[PDB]
Structure 1
């Protein structure tokens, strides 16, 4: 995690990432997809 001030590009600076998870799950990984929330309000139709 780092502080930043720009959306458009990745920073030209160096910081290593440290290990949170290390599980012996054994499942191979070919593909993936991101999870991101959608907003809805009175303005939106709210249809799923």
Structure 2
């Protein structure tokens, strides 16, 4: 983006530093999320786990902890992802 206009909410967490430079191969971290909207509350659950696997999803039980509950009240029908290009 190149703008910021008519904002009704902003949140920023504490700054950290993570992998940014270009790498290609087996993935190292699987970060799973659940996004749901209940009565205007946007509930985000997630779990980050180490992996050593490039192929399809590993089989194995893993529970997702809750992390965020955002009161937004927006009628959501579509969504899109954001990809990083080197």
User: Aligning the two structures, in what range does the TM-score lie when normalised by the shorter sequence?
Assistant: 0.5 to 0.7
Match of 1:16 in 2: 63
CA distance in 1, matches of 2:73, 2:51: 35
How many residues align? The count is 39
Taking only aligned residues, the RMSD between alpha carbons, in angstroms, comes to 1.2
Q: CA deviation at 1:28?
A: 2.5
Unaligned runs of 5+ in 2: 1-47
CA distance in 1, matches of 2:59, 2:85: 31
Q: What is the TM-score normalised by the length of structure 1?
A: 0.64
Q: CA deviation at 1:36?
A: 1.4
Q: Which runs of 4+ in 1 moved over 3 A?
A: none
Give the greater-gyration-radius structure (CA).
1
Larger relative contact order (CA 8 Å, sep ≥ 6): 2
